[PDB]
Design a protein around this ligand. Structure first.
Ligand SMILES: CC(C)CCC[C@@H](C)[C@H]1CC[C@H]2[C@@H]3CC=C4C[C@@H](O)CC[C@]4(C)[C@H]3CC[C@]12C
Ligand SMILES: CC(C)CCC[C@@H](C)[C@H]1CC[C@H]2[C@@H]3CC=C4C[C@@H](O)CC[C@]4(C)[C@H]3CC[C@]12C
Lengths: 161, 380, 33, 35, 388, 390
């Protein structure tokens, strides 16, 4: 009940209720049936203040879900620019791979999130990392027709961090 | 919020299956069945169906990455709309007897929604389109019933207002949606749709006409007006374009200018030259609308709206030759406009509800929102 | 009886194509060696 | 073409080996008004 | 040999000319014939163009197979109805010839991408012989009602193609293929065939219907069955996919299963609500087949179906035959129970046996069959442009 | 210059309206399905058949639409004036079908000069060629009284040789060795297959629309049906025969499969038996494939006549074959009318097409219509806004 209420508050962005639950003794690393903790839900919903507050209270940043997605993976797939920025600012691994081999850059490129793609490239995301299918962010952006993402990926090349 | 689309695995199938089961139950409780020209009568409805599915499905597939959704969602919309229009035209005109004429009229009512949806396609999911289909068919039936009750006309004959009703309904619904492009193979597929619409539009202008000479003259007038409108639209596209080039998108919408302009008066025009004059004037007005309407969301639906208004006005002009009837006809037009605007507003506020899981405004005009694609990360 | 026509007709087609292929096919075996 | 091989039907098989490779040319060389 | 295909095409055409000169002699049904013509040549042909590198072969071999098929089906169907004698040609002969072409194209759906045009000519000839014999059996010995041909056309073609594809099984293609994948514009093109089939199916089920109440019932029942089938196919495609996404295979094929499963009961007095029930069941069955039965057929039963013609034609065709039996049960038709059931069983069994024999013939390495790596590729038989 | 196209079009349309008001007044429903099929042929089959060019699909289908839309009006006017000897006439379904036939002739001629002309040039070519076609077909049908119900000569041969003459006059020295834009693409060829299939399916309506109701219309429909069926088989066989490694060519499958429908036109209503129509279709396919393989390169390089869609191999040679098939049919008894009149109709069609095409091309050779340069041939961007994404 307490963990479920805390996770619901994290999803809804109710930072006061989540802070109350953490005060009462709810473990911050608790996750739902899909392996998503409060950081994952806040990253999904774009709750930047909740993300920062949970990072302050020593949540495990590189905790993966049952699909292997980190909080940065979820924030890149959801296109939360500010959440991606804050997660990288707190030391999220931009080159993390999920179970199927997806990187945050791949999820940002497949979803036509140009701002996330640009920020990840500026933070040293390696676009040569392929999934288990052999697909790159450039390949998935070409397949999906994301022309701006394709152009930015080609123009960036290997400029690095 | 989250730009990744919310799962519709429980909303869309439950919604569609509930709709289909309700339609089955209503058909069982209220519908019933019961010669020489069976195939000839079937041909008009078949032409209407070919236009509604193919032409109105491919005509709005010019989008670089929304052709799948345009075509398939048009098919879904037609399939739902014909059944619901059968039931509602049975309810608001009397048990429901299903003839081929009733199916033809239901197809016309569905074409109204199919024309309206072109102003909102690319910005809605399937459930919002279901809501649009149901509410728009209901509003069109209510409009026809109100006209039949006030002006003492036939309910089925009031369906001549469907051009202007569909145009203003689509504009009003598109105005209420949240606010935010073309490729070559998608534009060619769209030319195919526009060509089928242009070729079979003389069937739109005479499904409700019983006398064979009236259908004769209506088809002749529509054919010649559409020819003149094609010539005027293709040639005048260069003038109404910043780079002085012909626009495939303008041609797709403007080829139907003559058919729209003479649709309400094709059976009253006595000579082909008058239909050709009306088609030429419709083409020139289409050029002017292309050159002016973007200055003052969909420009093609705006020019369709102005063309439908022009068609009603030329009906008003021609009916005097063939002043109380003038006032009555302007009143019928204004009532149709008011009901179209009000029902479009109601539909727009219904579509803005959070329960429909509408796509994010950054995800408009994208098939990836609704369709499965390989090599994609799915879920969280 | 009409079944025998489709059979006789099928037999004629099968006999022709088979014989033609058999001849050129054989001459290939005589020619390559 | 007139040498004896000593193999039964050797002349026949040598005749076939000599002429039948040119069968494709035997149809294309006929496309002329002289033919 | 590169000359096998032109040789067989020329020889078959000469045989058709001779047979027409030996057996053949010389307007209200012409629009329905033209609708069926559009179905046969555009709907099936472009429905199959979903493969990214097989569109040329799909549409062109569709045209070639159906063009040979209408002639050969005309000859075979006449010699049966004429009992070996000269017969005249009207609009109904043309409609039935296009029906035979439809059966062959449905079977071609099962072997798309893995067969040569020569194999296609051979299967056209043999399958038309088997189909015409089974159709004569159903229509004259059993005298069953199959006006939309859920049994004689759709189920027959599906199980004939399944038997052929089972005989032509390749071990290297069981785990999938790199070329066996759709493209975006390819699915856009396949929607053309889907839409034309959906639009003109009421003429397919009513072309040779008895004029009067039966033809009108066929038209109306087919139309409402398709209307319900579209909604149910969309709903179940969303249901079976992750996050409720729509699968283009489902929308392309399962949307037409209502026209297949209503064929037997098309002219019967099954009422529009009954036709809509049949269409909904057909759409659900087709989507479930595509999602679950096709992987089980490919991996476990070692039957690979390229276009999923089982889920569109066989299972909906079997459902249509069963619906005909049930309609006979509750007074919707005066045809016998046992004759409908015998028609279903004979159609399925004759299709399987003829497909076994035809596939055994097609397995001989004489027809230029493509290699495992060259399957679903136009370049084996076509000149392909450099750009898409 | 910048307004020549809209100004010429508006002047032509005002002329059409004035002529219609001066000369045009107002069985129909039994012939309407056939007219609908012919209309689908004209505006979809011909339009998408020429969309095989990778950078000319927009211009192909759009100029097809514009040319046919103008052509139906102008053909109605000219054919009605010729039939009524300058008197006012009432249009029926036959007038619509004949106007679409005139538009078909103009589109056949357009297939020869695809990619090398401007829309203004096509407006002028439509206007002149409809007059020439209507006069020749009036001569054939009324003075010669020949039987050409499928119009292998009045439509197909006439349009093919008219376009050949126009292309010969409009010859470009820089296009003799080919052009980088003169090649097909995958999806462009699929659209071309759309056009091919629609023409192929609805051709029986094309060949039987004018034919007298009864046995003649049924014979035309059956003969076109089986001739096209045989033509597909022979076109596929000879496409496999003539190309490298036996590979099939999309040009052959797209065009030579309609040769049987082209060549059966004169003998369509005649009693040649379905087997005779299958022989004509089988030869028509052979001749079309052989023409595409051999005669088109020789015409382009040696004779300086570049023909983009190969409309010679589809309409001219099969049209002359259908014309000659009609001569052998009257000789074999399958027809009324004289052999001399069929031969006169064939010769008049060819000669009038050549002379009128020479005159029309000389008119079109003037530098006033904005014809494209050598680089800009077969390119949509000369006249259309082309999307950046394919
Ligand atoms: C038409 C379908 C649904 C039912 C009947 C199909 C049966 C008869 C077919 C389809 C599956 C087929 C088998 C599939 C795979 C192979 C492997 C091959 O190396 C030898 C033949 C063999 C063993 C086939 C034998 C015949 C078979 C059993
Ligand atoms: C798929 C297999 C199990 C076949 C069963 C299909 C069922 C759902 C179909 C097939 C036959 C159909 C019936 C046929 C005849 C009747 C009587 C008629 O006056 C109304 C429709 C009604 C009541 C139909 C209802 C639906 C029905 C029962």
């Amino acid at each position: 009940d307490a963990a479920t209420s805390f996770l619901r508050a994290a999803r809804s962005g109710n930072l006061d209720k989540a802070l109350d639950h953490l005060r009462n003794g709810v473990d911050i690393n608790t996750c739902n049936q899909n392996g998503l903790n409060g950081l994952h839900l806040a990253s999904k919903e774009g709750h930047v203040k909740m993300v920062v507050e949970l990072l302050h209270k020593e949540i495990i940043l590189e905790t993966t879900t049952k699909k292997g997605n980190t909080a940065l993976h979820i924030a890149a797939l959801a296109g939360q620019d500010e959440v991606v920025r804050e997660l990288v600012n707190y030391g999220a691994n931009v080159n993390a791979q999920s179970q199927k081999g997806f990187t945050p850059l791949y999820m940002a490129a497949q979803e036509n999130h140009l701002e996330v793609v640009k920020f990840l490239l500026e933070n040293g995301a390696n676009q040569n990392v392929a999934t288990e299918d052999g697909f790159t962010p450039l390949a998935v952006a070409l397949q999906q027709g994301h022309e701006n993402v394709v152009a930015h990926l080609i123009n960036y090349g290997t400029k690095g961090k | 919020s989250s730009k990744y689309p919310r799962s519709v695995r429980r909303c869309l199938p439950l919604w569609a299956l509930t709709l289909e089961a309700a339609l089955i139950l209503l058909f069982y409780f209220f519908t019933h069945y019961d010669q020489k020209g069976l195939v000839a009568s079937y041909q008009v409805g078949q032409d209407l169906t070919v236009m509604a599915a193919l032409g109105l499905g491919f005509l709005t597939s010019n989008f670089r990455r929304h052709s799948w959704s345009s075509v398939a969602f048009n098919l879904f919309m037609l399939a739902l709309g014909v059944q619901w229009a059968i039931l509602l035209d049975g309810f608001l005109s009397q048990k429901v007897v299903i003839t081929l004429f009733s199916i033809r009229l239901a197809t016309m009512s569905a074409m109204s929604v199919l024309i309206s949806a072109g102003a909102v396609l690319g910005k809605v999911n399937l459930a919002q389109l279901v809501v649009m289909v149901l509410v728009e068919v209901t509003a069109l039936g209510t409009l026809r019933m109100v006209i039949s009750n006030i002006f003492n006309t036939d309910y089925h004959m009031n369906l001549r207002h469907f051009y202007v009703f569909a145009a203003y309904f689509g504009l009003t619904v598109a105005w209420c949606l949240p606010k935010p492009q073309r490729a070559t193979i998608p534009s060619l597929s769209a030319m195919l749709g526009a060509l089928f619409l242009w070729m079979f539009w003389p069937s739109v202008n005479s499904p409700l006409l019983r006398s064979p000479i009236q259908r004769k003259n209506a088809m002749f007038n529509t054919y010649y007006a559409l020819a003149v409108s094609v010539v005027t639209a293709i040639s005048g596209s260069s003038l109404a374009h910043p780079q002085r080039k012909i626009s495939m998108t303008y041609v797709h919408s403007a080829v139907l200018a003559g058919g729209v302009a003479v649709g309400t008066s094709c059976h009253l025009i006595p000579s082909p030259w008058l239909a050709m004059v009306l088609g030429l004037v419709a083409g020139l007005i289409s050029i002017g609308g292309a050159k002016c309407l973007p200055v003052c969301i969909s420009v093609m639906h705006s020019i369709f709206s102005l063309l439908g208004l022009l068609g009603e006005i030329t009906y008003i002009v021609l009916l005097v030759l063939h002043g109380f009837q003038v006032l009555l006809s302007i009143g019928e037009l204004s009532l149709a406009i008011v009901i179209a605007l009000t029902s479009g507003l109601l539909t727009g506020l219904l579509l803005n509800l959070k329960i429909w899981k509408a796509p994010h405004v950054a995800k408009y005009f994208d098939d990836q929102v609704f369709w499965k694609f390989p090599h994609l990360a799915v879920g969280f | 009886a009409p079944v025998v026509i489709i059979l006789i007709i099928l037999c004629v087609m099968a006999g022709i194509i088979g014989t033609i292929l058999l001849i050129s096919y054989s001459i290939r075996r005589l020619i390559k060696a | 073409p007139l040498q004896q091989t000593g193999q039964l039907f050797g002349g026949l098989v040598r005749d076939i080996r000599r002429r039948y490779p040119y069968y494709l040319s035997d149809i294309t060389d006929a496309f002329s008004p002289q033919v | 040999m590169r000359f096998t295909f032109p040789l067989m095409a020329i020889v078959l055409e000469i045989a058709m000319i001779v047979l027409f000169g030996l057996f053949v002699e010389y307007f209200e049904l012409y629009p329905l014939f033209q609708d069926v013509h559009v179905m046969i040549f555009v709907g099936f042909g472009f429905l199959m163009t979903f493969l990214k590198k097989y569109g040329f072969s799909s549409v062109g071999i569709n045209l070639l197979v159906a063009a040979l098929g209408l002639q050969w089906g005309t000859i075979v169907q006449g010699i049966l109805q004429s009992q070996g004698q000269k017969f005249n040609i009207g609009i109904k002969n043309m409609i039935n010839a296009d029906f035979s072409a439809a059966t062959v194209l449905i079977s071609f759906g099962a072997v798309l991408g893995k067969t040569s045009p020569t194999q296609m000519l051979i299967m056209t000839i043999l399958e038309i012989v088997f189909f015409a014999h089974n159709e004569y059996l159903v229509s004259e010995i059993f005298k069953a009602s199959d006006i939309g041909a859920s049994m004689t056309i759709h189920a027959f073609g599906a199980y004939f193609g399944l038997a052929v594809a089972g005989i032509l099984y390749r071990s290297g293609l069981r785990k999938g293929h790199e070329n066996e994948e759709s493209a975006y514009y390819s699915d856009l093109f396949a929607m053309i065939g889907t839409l034309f089939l959906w639009m003109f199916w009421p003429s397919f089920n009513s072309a040779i219907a008895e004029p009067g109440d039966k033809q009108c019932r066929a038209i109306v029942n087919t139309y409402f069955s398709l209307a319900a089938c579209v909604l149910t196919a969309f709903a179940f495609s969303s249901l079976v996919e992750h996050r409720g996404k729509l699968n283009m295979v489902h929308i392309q094929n399962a949307t037409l299963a209502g026209g297949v499963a209503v064929g037997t009961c098309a002219d019967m007095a099954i009422h529009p609500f009954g036709s809509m029930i049949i269409g909904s069941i057909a759409g659900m069955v087709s989507v479930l087949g595509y999602k679950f039965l096709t992987p089980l057929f490919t991996t476990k039963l070692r039957i690979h179906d390229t276009c999923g013609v089982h889920n569109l034609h066989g299972l909906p065709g079997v459902v249509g035959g069963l619906a005909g039996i049930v309609a006979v049960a509750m007074g919707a038709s005066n045809t016998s129970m046992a004759m409908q059931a015998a028609a279903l069983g004979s159609s399925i069994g004759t299709a399987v046996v003829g497909g076994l024999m035809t596939g055994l013939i097609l397995k001989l390495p004489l027809w230029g069959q493509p290699s495992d790596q060259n399957c679903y590729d136009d370049s084996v038989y076509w000149k392909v442009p450099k750009t898409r």
